Every structure is written in structure tokens, then in C-alpha cells.
Ligand binder design. Structure first.
Ligand SMILES: CCCCCCCCCCCCCCCCCC(=O)OC[C@H](COP(=O)(O)OCCN)OC(=O)CCCCCCCCCCCCCCCCC
Ligand SMILES: CCCCCCCCCCCCO[C@@H]1O[C@H](CO)[C@@H](O[C@H]2O[C@H](CO)[C@@H](O)[C@H](O)[C@H]2O)[C@H](O)[C@H]1O
Ligand SMILES: *C(=O)CCCCCCCCCCCCC
Lengths: 177, 12, 78, 117, 155, 170, 65, 104, 111, 86, 276, 126
């Protein structure tokens, strides 16, 4: 979620990802932990086996074969963590994640009940404004002369500088509001 | 610890 | 109220069904390097084997004990 | 039960099609049959509020069973002998209806025989 | 917003294809108009028919619910492919294998229900019997008219 | 109160209680306590009100509507006489809606009380419903949304003719 | 009560839940036993289901062909 | 294979701001600054203002508005058994006919 | 028939006071989850008196509370068929909802 | 459940690693790289993250799992995900 | 009603046999018992179909409360594969969770016996659809098979939940409401059955095997479940088959009907109506 | 075995032959797509995080979509044999079908009222 994806997965990434998928599905069939441990070690035997085959034209043919084998022995209903995509708690609290900007419409009589939270907030709104100009400038200075771009972002290279485009990450609502 | 809860302006 | 995790050399798989996994895997050159991370499930307060009769036949003891008392009472009360 | 096996599978003529019973004349094989007797009268069933399905030939017992359940209230457990009576009379009626399947089967099996002769 | 930032008519020349792609923020080799059958698409891109369930769930999409990014071209049928509606994601079981199995089961059960209608289960018991002419009066038969004596015997 | 001839109601026949168990009927207790704590205070509040309504006794009457010439007595086009014949019919037609409701109240009120004997003991009320329905259908059915006296008359004349033609053959 | 969280070890069980749980299981088991003693017939049966072949043509009134 | 040095340096900086943000969400001791029996008087005013008082109005409505209009309350006729004495007319229901008697 | 009718009608009034309270300023002062749970409990207990009277008499009712409108010869009235089914279901339903209402105060304690 | 605190996370991360066999506890610190100071391979670090997800009860997406290459990085990824700030 | 109901009870029970979410198993239990009430109405047994509703409300409500207690104590986890050994860590809930299962599966003299037993007695001794009778009895055994699935995986195996344990069930707002239902799950059917008026004549006369038919299949369902669920302890890998895929994927009815039907209709809404 | 795709059950990414393509021509396609993606993502962020913003962030992609589906359909519509038949059938197809259902039904109803063979027994509202 935090890291933007690359342009394309390498062979190394496509095999590790399969490895994790194939174990999680094994655990879905086995259930029992002792039985899940036994077959998880057999699974690693099948991945250590062709670990070094560096043909790079049969390694691929060993992956498409293994994905087509995974897709046939899927669990029709794998276990999912409650907060993960497809999970039962997935996005349960998204109705409680009010953006911080909604406080900017609060009535004064509402703001009068939290005088010290609302004072540590005008500092953050100042810090955000003074930092903005220097953030925009830094992002042009690192705009590579060749258009090739990636979703990643640069840090603060100086002192007294916050990393550019930091407000929507730092201020984001809590995972469990 | 008690945390602040961001809410919409309900005064209106 | 601070956490106080158990000593981590406590978790030893001996005398648990995780042993039989090392017996089976070690018969073909393999070995489970995460066995001790499963171990707390099969020892300590979680040891044993819950059998279905024990779940169904729960409180049968004191249910039957009350039955004879209740049954006896009707005989005497008759 | 057997009958379903017999009616399908083996023969199919010597078995009472259950929706046409009786089929042979009521007095056949009987010198004189005594018409079944109803203890309860229409006013009594009609005044104890018996559903039409309940106005069978055992109604006189159900009229007592209801009479108990109203009078032993709040003691809802104090009418087990009355229930047993009604349950018994119904069982006998049910046995009476079990004797019609046999009779019709047996008679209907007779006709198959003598017809061959 | 101006006329050249908005959809237009079908692109006839490759010079108006690369113009159209640049409008919609696509590669020229990726821009693909709908077929020109004059059904009103103009030059709007024809994008692969994948519902939004197939989009990377873990990515932080700009339009979070739609699983889109700001500026990206929107599929013609987006409102049919939002996550509340039609899902085209891969299934563990092939589409036709599900279709053959589901209706085979439903079809088989329909057959077996008719079988059970022509060979019903019952008990070896003659019909129930009721007094007073099959309860002729209590069923609402006419008091003045005389029913047909229907009688039952002890056996 | 209400007129017991408009709304006939068989007298109640409650069997006298026959308690043959030693236990106490919990219905008969909360019924006493209900009378003392609920019924008694309320009846005082009502007796207080009806003593006010006696001090300010006021009267109102049912309006009389004499009969005007029928539609049949109206020359075609004379809207002055058609209008009054039309107003009367609309008054009549409305009283017939309420007669039907009354006959329906009885049938519904009988169905409930007879209970499991409605198929037998609700014959008379089902017969009035079946008769007063045939009359209603012979007067008002199929007239349409723009129903009026003239259409009611046209429907009757077309029916008196279809029956006269019954005997003109038979 | 405000129990304490426990890591990897079996937790302590309050007496209330152990006995509240235990009573209900025994309350169930007593009631089955008590009922199955008085009213066993409702499960096993109360009335004999007559065999339909022991019956003789005399009562069924068959007329010998 | 993991974070690049520039990647890892951005996380340090954001994570620093982030935790300084969540700390700011904590409420001071004095917030919010609001502007100002087990079966008795606590359990009397409930069963005497939600059961008794509402029962007076519901009874008043039933007794003088529903029971004074025709057919508003209509009950099934009570069961009458061969042997009952009718509380109204005094009639006595004749006893039933006679049972041959049976025993299972 | 007044006590039977009044208790039948009174169940609805008890369940409507939590709805009315929720629409006033009081709801911000009381423990509204407990108030609803107490309210439904008293409703269940009242629902037993019509239940017992039916067990005694087996006598059903047809209570027309309100006349809503007449469509020529077809009146629509708010009317209740307090027979066997609605007498018993009403009690079973109010008994279960007394459990679920009190369960919710523990299950939804964070919401 | 109790709130997660930065030290409690740190203690549970190492605790899971100390029960791993291919790791040798005596040389296991928070800064231990999984591929250089401990000599674990790619196919192991995948199983290490899987062991963390089970420990804590939530998933780490693969785009992020493949960069958690030292116990501190894991501890900080969990801490930032669950809004833990001290 | 007799054939529509019979199909519902079998089809949903087949679905419930291989689900893993605790609620969907319980939700699929309801669909099957709902279908059985429907089968009852096809016997012209309206008062039995109603008495089942009144009885079924008690224990089924409890099963959701007992299940909903586990879900709260395990950080809102609902997959039974991550539950285990609940008969020990949560005694009270497990005890009520087993009263509910046995009341549901028609064990004698619990709330669900004074309804289910009569319906199974009636379905056998009425003229009816032979196949509706047959599948409705099979579905009555599967009610024991899938109940045993919960008892087994939830209460009987070894722990499979995460290692930080903060299970608390000492709150009165949890124990008291569950207890009320627990009393209802035991005694309620008895009281209801003896106080309601006699409705219909029960066919109380039948061979010895039609009078215990419900019990034997329910017992048999349990026995079959034990053997099957105890092969999962064997160090032998589990594989897909068409029959479990059908069970797990709800007979594919959602996967087809909820994809093809909304597509064609919503495609007509745009291509034909609005555009053309 | 093997998985047969369909429009409502697409092909998994891992079973796509064209997803294991690694020839340099594809990899360059996949890198320009990301660059276009990142260029936009950068521009959206430079508005989202801007503190001087006082209104929402207008979306040209959404304006184009809604305009393509309303104000731009007709100009880009050309009659053809397939459109004209489709509109003719879509237009009057259902309308003729229902005309015969209702006309046929009400003719059977008017036929049965002239010969009195209907049971309007308790019907007094219409
Ligand atoms: C709920 C539907 C009933 C609403 C009517 C009502 O309860 O209160 C007004 C009542 C009506 O007065 P009434 O003349 O008896 O009826 C015909 C005139 N509308 O007049 C009254 O009696 C108001 C005083 C009683 C209010 C308690 C009603 C509780 C039900
Ligand atoms: C008329 C209605 C009355 C119905 C009967 C009421 C019976 C009341 C039962 C009270 C139960 C007391 O509970 C007491 O606590 C212990 C806890 O160690 C329970 O349990 C203990 O014995 C049981 C017996 O198999 C073991 O399985 C268990 O591991 C152990 O803990 C016992 O059952 C009892 O010793
Ligand atoms: C003949 O009596 C037809 C009745 C219908 C057959 C139902 C079969 C029920 C199976 C119960 C198992 C019996 C154990 C010996």
C-alpha cells in the first residue's frame, strides 16, 4: 500500500509472489498446523529444487507451468485476513475516517471545547504553508531531464525541509478511528 | 490516552 | 500493566505431534525450521485431545447426579 | 414400506390404488355390517369449536381433552390421561383405516385369482 | 473546457489518432477507437472489458472507490463495472463448467421431482372418514337440501 | 352505544367458570388489580368529562334532503333540471357505498365470531352480501370514472331491454 | 473483572464462567434424563403398529372364492 | 533488494512527522471543556411512567372509543362444553352420550 | 376484552417510546441502549398476559383501532388479528429481541 | 485487545525470529540484515513475513513485503500501519 | 411448497457442509430449516410450520450470539480455520454453543425436538412426493454433519488463532442474554407444546423405523461427520473435487446469476434504451 | 483441466501468455505506461497537497466520459442498415408484441361477458 508498484515485475518477483500464494492456499486446505507445517516443507523442496536453474528460458517455462498448476489446485475459498482486500472487516471503518479538513468548518462553539487540540492544529497549518513553496521547487529540481518517471518521491535533502508532498500521508486518518 | 475524534461540523 | 512474554527456550517440540512431523520430514532429508513457532499450541494448557464425547457429555455427571436426587424425591414424595 | 415396493416393481393390479379405497361394495363378504357410530352430536362439536379436520369419529374424546385443558389451567401438565385417551381413540381409527388397505388388497388379490379361473 | 479537450468524431487519419490518444492520456500504440459503425462512440477509447474488482486492491488509487487514477481514461461502461455491480474477475472454475454443473443439478432435481410425482410415497391406509355425511352441513352445504347418504362401517 | 338493529350481535354465552385445580388463576388476579389501578381511575376521569358535556349539552341534526324530479323527468338539454337530478343521484350513489360497507362489516364481524363455524353459521350474512352485491353490480358496475345518472339510466334501459327480449322468445 | 492479556500461554478462567457454563450443560443433561424417563414413549413409541398379515379373513370379511 | 537509501530516508522523515501528528491528537487533561435504587425509585418511575400512565390512555381509548363503536372489538365465541353452565341465561348443556370405554 | 385489547395495543406504545425519545433532546442525557432494553423487556412481560389469556380461552380477537380512509365501498382500517399465531410469535419475538438488544450494548460498545 | 506499543511490537518481532531455526539467536539484533548479516535467501524472507502476518493478525502486501529486510524495518512497517506512535 | 421447500433444505445444507465463515454456516442453516418449514406447509401442516418458527427462533438466535461472542474475542475473525480449542478457553460460550447445536439437530426433549420430530414424523406418514421425502431426510442428516463441523473445528481441535490472547466473556451484557436463550433452547419447546390447543391429528401409529427415523439419521449424520472430519488429521494432502467445489461455491448460483443477469439487463439499459 | 475464459470470467493475469513476454519491445511499452501514469499521479498530488486550494480537484477524465455519453452521441451517429433495423425492432418490436397480448385478452374478456360465462361474483370496484 505504501510502496508504488514498479513498471514490471521481474522473474524474481513473480516467483516469490507465487511462493507466498501457494503457501497461503496450502494452509487453507490443511487447516491443522502440524499438517500445514509438513506440506509447507515439501513445498519449499519444490522451490529449492529448481532454485539455480539459470537457463532463463526454461525458468519461465517452469513458472507458467507452476501457475497453471496453482490455478487448478486453488482453494475455492482461501483464508483472508479480516482487514485485507476481500476480508470481512475490509473497509469496515471507512465510514469513520473523516478528513482533517472537516474541522475547518467547525463552529467556534464546537472549537471552544478543545482549545488545546485546536491550538496544536494552527501550528500544523502554518508548518504546512511555509513548507509548501520549497516543496514544489524541490520537485522540479529533481524532474529528470528524460521524461522517464516513477511514482516514488524524493526526501528532504536539506535542513528545515519536510519531504515534498507530505501532508496527505502524515495527516491521514487513523486505521481505527 | 484519549484521542481526538475528527467529526463533521454537527453544530448546524 | 506491561507485557511479559514467556521465555523462548520453553517452546520445545518434544512430545508433541510436531515431533512426528520431524520424524516424517527427516526421513527424506528435509526439516521444519518453524516447528518451535507452532509449539505453544500443542503443549502447556493446550495439551491433550478434546474428544467429541467429552464435549457432548459435559455436565452429564452433575445432570445425572441431580436426576437421581430428583427421581428419588418423587418416590419418597409419593 | 412393502406396499410401495409391491405396487411398483412387482405386480401392479393386486394393490389398492390408495385414492380409490373402498372399491368393492361395502357389504361384500359381510353378512351385515353395522354402520359406524358417532358419540358426539353436531351441536356439541359445533359448540366446542372443533376444526372440521378435528370432527372425525373420535371427537367425543377431544371434547373431554379440551374441557380438561381449560379447567386445569394454569396447570398445563394436568391433562395427560385425557390426551392419552384421545391419542388412543385416534390410533384405533388409524388401525381401522389400516384394515381397509388389507381388505381391499386381499379382495383385490382374490379377483385376480378367480378371474384367471 | 475547450473543443479539443473533449471527445470528437472518429479519427480517420493516423495524425488524428495520435491527437486523440494524447487527448485521453494514452500511448498512440494503445489508443483504439470503437469500431466505426456509427453508434455514437466517436473517438472515445475502447478499453479492455475488465471490471474494477480486478484492479489492484492494495494500490492507493486516487478515486479510491472506483479504483481509478486521476486523469486515466474511463471505460465506456464504467457504471456497469463499478464494484457494486458486474464482476468479471477470474473464477476458480471455468465459466462453462459452472454453467454445465449448475443446470445439470437443477435439471436433474426437476426430473427427480416428477419421478416422485408418478411414484408417490404413502401409507397402506384407506381414506380418512368423517361423520354426518362427510360433514356436509358443517362445510356449508345447504340446510334445506338433503345430502346423499355417505356411510362408513365398523370393519 | 350503537343501534343493535343496524349492527346485529348475538348475545354472549360465556360458560360459568369451573376451576377444578388447586392453583390460582393468574389471569383473574391481574384482572382485579387492573380494575383497581387502571379501570377505576380512568372511569373517574371519564365521569368528570361527561359531567362537563352535560353542562354544555349541544345538539346537531341529520340533514333532510327532500326528493327532486328524477333524471327520467328531465327534458334533454334542460341543464337546470338535469343538474338537480344529477346531484340527487350522486347523493344516492354515495349512500349506496356506505350501505355496502355496512353489509360488509356484518359479514366480517360474523366471520370472526363464528370462527371455526363460519362456513355454516355465517350463511345469512353471506346471503345478504351475495344479494346486495348483485343489486350493486346491476346499478353501478361498468359505469366508468365519469359515472352519472344518465349513464345509470342508459345502463338500466339496455338491461330492461335484454330481459324483455328473454320473454319475447320464451 | 478486567482480565489480563496473555501471550502464547493458556489464560486463567474466572470461576463465574466455569460454573455458569457448567450449570447450563448439567441443566440440559438433567432435563433430557428427566424427560426421557417419564416420557420415553414419545421417542420410542407408545402404540404397537399392528402387522397387516396376522389379520384373518374372518374379521376382514373376505368371501372365500 | 529492499528500500533504496533515498527510499529509506523518506520513510524516516515522514515517520517522524507522522508520530508527531498522532501525538498531537491526544486530549489534554481538561478536554472536552463542556459547559454545564437497584429496584426502587429508579425502578419505580419507569414502571409508573411507561406502563401505568400509558395504560390509562390506552384504556381510555379502548373503553370509550373502541368498545363504544360497532364491531371494533370482535372476539371468537368461547368454547362451551357438554356440562358447562352458561353464565348468562343459566342454561345447562346436557351431558354427552355414553362411551364403550377403552384401555390401551 | 379491554384488558386483552389494552395489553395488545400497549405493546406497540412501549416500543414507540424509544423511537420518540430518540427524536428529542433527552437521548443525549440518558443511557439510551439501556432504556430501549428495559422498554422491550416490559413489552415482553406485558406480551405474556395476552398470551396466557389465549392459553386459557383459545379465544381470538379482531381489533380495529383506526379508520384510515374509505375508497367508495372499500374501507381501509388499521386492524389487528390477535389470533393464535400473532399472540405467540409476539412473545417469542419480544423475548429474543430482549436478548439481542442487551447483547448489542456489549458487541457494539465501540461503534 | 490492548494497544500496540513500539516496544511490544519490537519484542514480538524478535521473539518470532528467535524461534526460527535458520537464524542463530546469539547474533540477532534489530539491525540484523536478513540477507547479509544472517545469510538468509529470498525464499526464506518470504516465510519470515508470513510468520509476522500470523503473529500480528494482518497481511503485509507483497509490494511491501519484499523490502522488509531487517527487524527494525518490519517493526517500523507494523508500527506505521497500526497508528502506533510511542 | 412441498417440492420448492424440499429443494431449499437439501441445496442449502449441501452448501453449508464446506463453508468456513462461521456466520455463513449458521446463515445456511437457516435457509435449510426455512425450507423444511416450507415442506411442512405442503403437508397441509400449518400449525407445525408455525410451531417450528417459534421453536427455531430460540436456539438459532443463541447460535449467532454464541458465535458472535467468539468473533468479538478473536479480533473479529470469522473463519473457523483460525478458531480452535474453544471448549476450553471459552467454556460458557462453548457450552451454550453445544446446547444450540443439539436443539437444532432434533435431540430429544430440547426446544427443537417438539417441532422437528413431529415434522419428520409427518413427512413419512403422508402421501407425498417420494423425492421430496427422500432429499428432506438426507438434508436432516446433513444438519448433523454441518453442526458437527462447527463443534469440531471451533471447539475441539487445537488452537489456530493468533498468539496474543485477550479473550474475555465475563460481561453480564454477554452472559445474561445468552443464558435467557439457553433456558429457551432447553425448556421453551416443552412449554409451548403442552399449552397450545390441539391442532391436527398426529399420525402416532407407524412402524418402529418411521418413529425413530429422525433420530437415527441425526445420529448417523454425526457419526459420518466424525470419520470424515478425522481424516483431516492425516498427513495426506486434500484435493479439489467437483462436489466440494459445488458445495463451497454455493452451487455456482451466485457466480452465474449475479454476473450474467445484471450484465444483460444493464447492457440493455444503455445500448438499447438510452442510446439507440 | 485447463481454464477456459469468458467475458464474465476473464483470464487470470498469471495464466496470460502475453504476461510472461519479456522481449525488449514490450518492456518499453510497460515503462512508458508507468511514466504516463506517474506524470498524472504527480499532477494530482500537486493539487491534493496544495494548501492554497479552496475548492475540489476538477477531473478532465470524468468530464470527457460524461460528455462522450450524452452530448457527443448524436453527432457521431450515422444511420446504417444495422442501426435502422435495430431501432425499428427495438422501437416497435415490444409495442406490437404487447398489443396482441392485451387485445387478444380483452377480446376473450368481452366475448365472455356477452354470453354471461364470467364469474364477477363479488366484484364491485374497478
Ligand atoms: C393510533 C390510531 C388511533 C389514533 C386516535 C387516538 O388514539 O386518539 C384520538 C382519539 C380519537 O377520538 P374518537 O372520537 O374516539 O375517534 C374518532 C375521531 N377521530 O381521541 C381520544 O380519545 C384521545 C385521548 C386518548 C389518547 C390515547 C390513545 C392511545 C392509543
Ligand atoms: C434441578 C436443576 C439442577 C441441575 C443440576 C445443577 C448442577 C450444577 C453443576 C455445578 C457445577 C460445579 O462445577 C464444578 O466445577 C468444575 C470445574 O473444575 C467442573 O468441572 C470439573 O469436572 C469436570 C467433570 O468432567 C471436568 O471435565 C473438568 O475438567 C473439571 O474442571 C465440575 O463440573 C464441578 O466440579
Ligand atoms: C415405506 O414404509 C415407505 C416410507 C418411506 C421410507 C423412508 C426411509 C427412512 C430411513 C430411516 C432409517 C431406518 C433405520 C433402520
Amino acid at each position: 500500500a505504501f510502496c508504488a508498484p514498479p513498471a514490471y515485475l521481474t522473474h524474481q518477483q513473480k516467483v516469490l509472489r507465487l511462493y507466498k500464494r501457494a503457501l497461503r492456499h496450502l494452509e487453507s486446505w490443511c487447516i491443522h498446523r502440524d499438517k500445514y507445517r509438513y506440506f509447507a516443507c515439501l513445498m519449499r523442496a519444490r522451490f529449492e529444487e529448481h532454485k539455480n536453474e539459470k537457463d532463463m528460458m526454461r525458468a519461465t517455462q517452469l513458472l507458467r507451468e507452476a501457475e497453471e498448476e496453482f490455478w487448478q489446485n486453488q482453494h475455492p475459498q482461501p483464508y483472508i485476513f479480516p482487514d485485507s482486500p476481500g476480508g470481512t472487516s475490509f473497509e469496515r471503518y471507512e465510514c469513520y475516517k473523516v478528513p482533517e479538513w472537516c474541522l475547518d468548518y467547525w463552529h467556534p462553539s464546537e472549537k471552544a471545547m478543545y482549545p488545546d487540540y485546536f491550538s496544536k492544529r494552527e501550528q500544523w497549518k502554518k508548518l504546512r504553508m511555509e513548507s509548501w513553496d520549497r516543496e514544489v521547487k524541490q520537485l522540479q529540481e529533481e524532474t529528470s531531464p528524460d521524461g522517464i518517471m516513477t511514482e516514488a518521491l524524493p526526501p528532504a535533502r536539506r535542513e528545515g525541509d519536510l519531504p515534498p508532498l507530505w501532508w496527505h500521508i502524515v495527516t491521514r486518518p487513523r486505521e481505527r478511528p | 490516552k484519549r484521542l481526538f475524534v475528527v467529526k463533521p461540523s454537527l453544530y448546524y | 500493566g506491561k507485557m511479559e512474554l514467556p521465555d523462548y527456550r520453553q517452546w520445545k517440540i518434544e512430545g508433541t505431534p510436531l515431533e512426528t512431523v520431524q520424524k516424517k520430514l527427516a526421513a527424506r532429508g528435509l526439516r521444519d525450521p518453524w516447528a518451535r513457532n507452532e509449539a505453544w499450541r500443542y503443549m502447556g494448557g493446550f495439551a491433550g485431545n478434546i474428544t467429541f464425547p467429552s464435549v457432548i457429555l459435559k455436565g452429564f455427571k452433575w445432570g445425572f447426579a441431580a436426576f437421581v436426587v430428583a427421581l428419588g424425591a418423587e418416590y419418597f414424595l409419593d | 414400506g412393502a406396499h410401495l415396493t409391491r405396487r411398483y416393481l412387482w405386480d401392479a393390479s393386486v394393490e389398492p390404488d390408495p385414492e380409490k379405497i373402498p372399491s368393492f361394495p361395502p357389504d361384500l363378504g359381510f353378512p351385515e355390517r353395522k354402520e359406524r357410530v358417532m358419540v358426539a352430536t353436531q351441536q356439541e362439536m359445533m359448540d366446542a369449536q372443533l376444526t372440521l379436520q378435528q370432527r372425525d369419529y373420535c371427537a367425543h374424546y377431544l371434547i373431554r381433552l379440551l374441557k380438561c385443558k381449560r379447567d386445569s389451567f394454569p396447570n398445563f401438565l394436568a391433562c395427560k390421561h385425557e390426551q392419552h385417551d384421545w391419542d388412543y381413540c385416534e390410533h384405533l381409527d388409524y388401525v381401522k383405516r389400516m384394515k381397509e388397505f388389507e381388505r381391499e388388497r386381499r379382495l383385490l388379490q382374490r379377483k385376480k385369482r378367480r378371474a384367471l379361473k | 473546457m475547450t473543443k479539443d479537450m473533449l471527445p470528437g468524431s472518429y479519427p480517420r487519419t493516423p495524425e488524428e489518432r495520435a491527437a486523440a490518444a494524447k487527448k485521453y492520456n494514452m500511448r498512440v500504440e494503445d489508443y483504439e477507437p470503437y469500431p466505426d459503425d456509427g453508434m455514437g462512440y466517436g473517438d472515445y477509447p475502447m478499453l479492455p472489458n475488465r471490471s474494477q474488482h480486478e484492479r489492484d486492491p492494495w494500490y492507493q488509487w486516487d478515486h479510491s472507490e472506483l479504483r481509478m487514477n486521476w486523469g486515466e481514461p474511463i471505460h465506456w461502461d464504467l457504471d456497469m463495472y463499478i464494484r457494486n455491480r458486474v464482476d468479471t474477475s477470474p473464477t476458480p472454475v471455468s465459466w462453462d463448467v459452472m454453467c454445465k454443473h449448475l443446470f445439470g443439478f437443477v435439471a436433474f432435481m426437476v426430473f427427480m421431482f416428477w419421478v416422485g410425482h408418478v411414484f408417490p410415497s404413502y401409507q397402506p391406509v384407506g381414506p380418512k372418514q368423517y361423520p354426518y355425511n362427510n360433514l356436509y352441513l358443517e362445510r356449508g352445504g345447504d340446510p334445506t337440501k338433503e345430502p346423499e347418504p355417505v356411510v362408513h362401517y365398523d370393519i | 352505544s350503537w343501534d343493535k338493529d343496524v349492527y346485529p350481535e348475538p348475545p354472549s354465552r360465556t360458560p360459568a367458570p369451573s376451576p377444578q385445580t388447586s392453583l390460582p388463576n393468574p389471569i383473574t388476579y391481574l384482572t382485579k388489580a387492573y380494575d383497581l389501578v387502571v379501570d377505576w381511575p380512568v372511569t373517574l376521569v371519564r365521569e368528570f368529562i361527561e359531567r362537563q358535556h352535560a353542562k354544555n349539552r349541544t345538539y346537531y341534526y341529520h340533514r333532510q334532503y327532500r326528493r327532486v324530479p328524477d333524471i327520467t323527468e328531465c327534458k334533454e338539454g334542460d341543464v337546470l333540471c338535469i343538474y338537480e337530478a344529477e346531484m340527487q343521484w350522486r347523493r344516492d350513489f354515495k349512500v349506496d357505498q356506505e350501505i355496502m360497507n355496512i353489509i360488509q362489516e356484518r359479514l366480517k364481524a360474523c366471520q370472526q365470531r363464528e370462527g371455526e363455524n363460519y362456513q355454516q353459521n355465517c350463511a345469512k350474512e353471506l346471503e345478504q352480501f351475495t344479494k346486495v352485491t348483485k343489486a350493486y353490480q346491476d346499478r353501478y358496475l361498468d359505469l366508468g370514472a365519469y359515472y352519472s345518472a344518465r349513464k345509470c339510466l342508459a345502463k338500466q334501459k339496455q338491461r330492461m331491454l335484454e330481459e324483455r327480449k328473454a320473454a319475447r322468445q320464451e | 473483572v478486567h482480565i489480563q492479556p496473555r501471550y502464547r500461554e493458556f489464560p486463567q478462567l474466572t470461576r463465574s464462567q466455569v460454573i455458569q457454563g457448567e450449570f447450563l450443560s448439567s441443566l440440559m443433561w438433567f432435563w433430557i434424563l428427566w424427560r426421557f424417563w417419564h416420557d420415553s414413549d414419545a421417542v420410542l413409541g407408545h402404540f404397537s403398529y399392528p402387522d397387516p398379515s396376522q389379520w384373518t379373513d374372518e374379521e376382514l370379511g373376505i368371501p372365500p372364492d | 533488494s529492499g528500500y533504496t537509501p533515498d527510499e529509506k530516508l523518506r520513510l524516516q522523515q515522514l515517520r517522524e512527522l507522522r508520530r508527531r501528528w498522532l501525538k498531537d491528537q491526544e486530549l489534554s487533561p481538561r478536554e472536552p471543556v463542556l459547559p454545564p435504587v437497584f429496584k426502587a425509585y429508579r425502578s419505580s418511575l419507569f414502571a409508573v411512567s411507561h406502563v401505568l400512565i400509558p395504560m390509562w390512555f390506552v384504556h381510555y381509548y379502548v373503553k370509550y372509543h373502541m368498545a363504544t363503536k360497532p364491531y371494533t372489538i370482535v372476539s371468537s365465541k368461547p368454547r362451551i362444553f357438554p356440562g358447562d353452565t352458561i353464565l348468562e341465561t343459566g342454561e345447562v348443556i346436557p351431558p354427552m352420550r355414553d362411551f364403550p370405554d377403552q384401555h390401551h | 376484552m379491554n384488558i386483552f385489547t389494552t395489553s395488545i395495543l400497549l405493546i406497540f406504545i412501549l416500543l414507540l417510546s424509544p423511537i420518540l425519545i430518540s427524536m428529542s433532546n433527552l437521548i443525549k442525557h440518558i443511557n439510551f441502549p439501556l432504556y430501549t432494553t428495559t422498554s422491550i423487556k416490559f413489552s415482553f412481560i406485558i406480551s405474556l398476559l395476552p398470551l396466557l389469556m389465549f392459553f386459557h380461552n383459545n379465544m381470538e380477537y379482531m381489533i380495529t383501532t383506526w379508520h384510515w380512509v374509505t375508497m367508495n365501498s372499500m374501507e381501509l382500517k388499521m386492524s389487528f388479528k390477535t389470533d393464535f399465531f400473532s399472540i405467540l410469535f409476539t412473545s417469542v419475538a419480544l423475548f429474543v429481541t430482549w436478548s439481542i438488544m442487551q447483547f448489542s450494548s456489549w458487541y457494539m460498545h465501540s461503534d | 485487545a490492548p494497544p500496540l506499543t513500539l516496544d511490544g511490537i519490537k519484542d514480538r518481532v524478535l521473539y518470532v525470529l528467535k524461534l526460527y531455526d535458520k537464524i542463530d539467536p546469539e547474533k540477532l539484533s534489530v539491525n540484523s540484515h536478513f540477507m547479509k548479516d544472517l545469510g538468509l535467501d529470498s525464499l526464506d524472507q518470504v516465510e519470515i513475513i508470513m510468520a509476522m502476518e500470523d503473529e500480528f493478525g494482518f497481511e503485509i502486501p507483497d509490494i511491501d513485503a519484499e523490502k522488509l529486510m531487517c527487524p527494525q524495518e518490519i517493526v517500523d512497517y507494523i508500527a506505521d500501519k497500526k497508528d502506533v506512535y510511542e | 411448497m412441498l417440492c420448492l421447500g424440499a429443494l431449499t433444505t437439501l441445496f442449502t445444507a449441501i452448501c453449508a457442509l464446506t463453508q468456513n465463515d462461521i456466520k455463513k454456516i449458521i446463515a445456511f442453516s437457516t435457509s435449510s430449516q426455512l425450507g423444511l418449514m416450507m415442506v411442512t406447509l405442503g403437508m397441509n401442516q400449518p400449525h407445525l410450520a408455525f410451531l417450528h418458527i417459534c421453536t427455531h427462533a430460540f436456539f438459532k438466535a443463541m447460535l449467532f450470539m454464541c458465535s458472535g461472542s467468539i468473533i468479538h474475542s478473536l479480533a473479529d475473525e470469522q473463519d473457523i480455520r483460525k478458531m480452535g480449542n474453544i471448549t476450553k478457553i471459552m467454556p460458557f460460550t462453548s457450552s451454550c454453543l453445544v446446547i444450540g447445536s443439539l436443539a437444532l439437530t432434533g435431540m430429544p426433549f430440547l426446544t427443537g425436538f417438539y417441532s422437528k420430530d413431529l415434522i419428520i414424523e409427518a413427512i413419512n406418514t403422508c402421501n407425498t412426493n417420494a423425492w421430496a421425502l427422500l432429499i428432506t431426510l438426507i438434508a436432516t442428516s446433513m444438519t448433523a454433519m454441518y453442526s458437527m463441523r462447527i463443534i469440531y473445528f471451533v471447539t475441539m481441535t487445537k488452537p489456530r488463532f493468533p498468539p496474543l490472547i485477550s479473550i474475555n466473556e465475563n460481561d453480564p451484557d454477554l452472559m445474561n442474554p445468552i443464558k435467557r436463550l439457553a433456558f429457551g433452547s432447553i425448556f421453551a419447546g416443552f412449554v409451548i407444546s403442552y399449552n397450545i390447543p390441539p391442532t391436527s391429528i398426529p399420525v402416532l401409529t407407524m412402524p418402529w423405523f418411521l418413529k425413530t427415523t429422525a433420530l437415527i439419521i441425526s445420529v448417523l449424520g454425526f457419526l459420518i461427520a466424525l470419520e470424515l472430519n478425522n481424516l483431516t488429521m492425516k498427513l495426506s494432502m486434500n484435493k479439489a473435487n467437483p462436489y466440494s467445489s459445488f458445495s463451497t461455491l454455493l452451487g455456482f448460483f451466485p457466480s452465474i446469476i449475479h454476473r450474467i443477469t445484471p450484465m444483460k439487463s444493464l447492457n440493455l439499459s444503455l445500448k438499447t434504451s438510452l442510446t439507440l | 483441466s485447463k481454464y477456459k475464459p469468458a467475458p464474465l470470467a476473464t483470464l487470470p493475469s498469471t495464466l496470460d501468455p502475453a504476461e510472461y513476454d519479456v522481449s525488449p519491445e514490450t518492456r518499453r511499452a510497460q515503462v512508458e505506461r508507468l511514466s504516463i501514469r506517474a506524470r498524472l499521479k504527480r499532477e494530482y498530488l500537486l493539487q491534493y497537497n496544495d494548501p492554497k486550494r479552496v475548492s475540489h480537484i476538477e477531473d478532465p477524465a470524468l468530464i470527457r466520459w460524461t460528455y462522450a455519453r450524452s452530448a457527443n452521441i448524436y453527432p457521431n451517429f450515422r444511420p446504417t442498415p444495422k442501426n435502422s433495423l435495430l431501432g425499428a425492432v427495438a422501437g416497435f418490436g415490444p409495442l406490437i408484441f404487447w398489443y396482441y397480448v392485451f387485445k387478444t385478452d380483452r377480446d376473450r374478456k368481452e366475448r365472455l361477458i356477452q354470453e354471461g360465462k364470467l364469474d364477477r361474483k363479488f366484484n364491485i370496484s374497478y
